[PDB]
Amino acid sequence: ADIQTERAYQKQPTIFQNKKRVLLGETGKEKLPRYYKNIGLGFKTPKEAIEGTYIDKKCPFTGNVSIRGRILSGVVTKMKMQRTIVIRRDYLHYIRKYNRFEKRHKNMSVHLSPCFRDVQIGDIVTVGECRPLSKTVRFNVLKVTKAAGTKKQ
Amino acid sequence: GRMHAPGKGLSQSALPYRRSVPTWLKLTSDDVKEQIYKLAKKGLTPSQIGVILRDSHGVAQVRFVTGNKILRILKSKGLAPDLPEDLYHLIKKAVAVRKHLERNRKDKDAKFRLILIESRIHRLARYYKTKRVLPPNWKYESSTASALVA
């Protein structure tokens, strides 16, 4: 519900909240300033990252990761394991002797920031390489594309 | 050949080349739609509506007269059936076989045929699931199917 659900106070490290709030200000409404950055490579910052209130230190827009290296794509298959999803990347492997292909796949775990709210199984995501964020996570979700949906019953 | 039979039968309809409405058909599009609405409110399936309109009204194809098909007309009017009609008939046949089979337990032929009918049901339901005609959680349950049909 609220964002302070941990044992330690959750805050963006580069925002000073206690900026001498005195009688000349309104009580309220006050809204504490939000740190966000523009990652390069022509990727738009989602508006939910602009005026959201989540704290995520591994978010590419409001956190302390920097995207560099490889930009890949895949299809969401699991959405357990909080703030992290499993995507599947299918590809064809060429075998020279029979001069045909075979179908292979690899899973990678990627960090899904809470600026992407309506993410479902079967969606196509764009991921960017960052520094190691955990034992197995090295990529971070940059853009979510819906697949054959947008209309429900 | 057939999906679940060893038949190579060749019998079907042969639509003619000319798609134009014949000059003798003194029926415009909207009153043909009204006949469709009357028959559908009487409780008929689109196959039966087409059969009646062909047999005793001169409408050989409503797609050439109205411009679209019977189920599209019923859906636009908001009175298309909730299940697709072929899935409905397959479930009806499955229920009939299952009731007969529970009163006659030594009919192994009916057991074999019920396996075939339910396989066809599941293939059809998978197709309708991919095309969003059925809900994604839809599932042919044998125990509650009879309350859905007939």
Partner: protein
Amino acid sequence: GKCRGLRTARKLRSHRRDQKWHDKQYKKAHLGTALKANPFGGASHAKGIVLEKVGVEAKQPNSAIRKCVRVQLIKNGKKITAFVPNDGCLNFIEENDEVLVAGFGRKGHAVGDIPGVRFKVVKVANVSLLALYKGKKERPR
């Protein structure tokens, strides 16, 4: 028939190796039972010590006594039977001599009318058997 699809390389390759296990030579070379069973252990020759001089009766329709020796190898001390080829070469070999032993030609298969013998003697104690037969050298006495 076989599958010809563009994405069928896994099926083709898996089938080929599963079916490669069905010929005698591939299985003999790649299973390891044959390598463990043969006394030479993958070597081409071996050294051993003569235990006794035997004569094996030739297979029908031939009729002779083929002069062999019973040899116990120095490594892995199995006991084999080795042919002693030529007209008088058995008289060169004395009991408890130390011979070299080669294959007899058909890669672990018996040869000729000699039943069950896969080995022949080359170089009874270190002077070679051909030089002894041809008079080139003599026993180191």
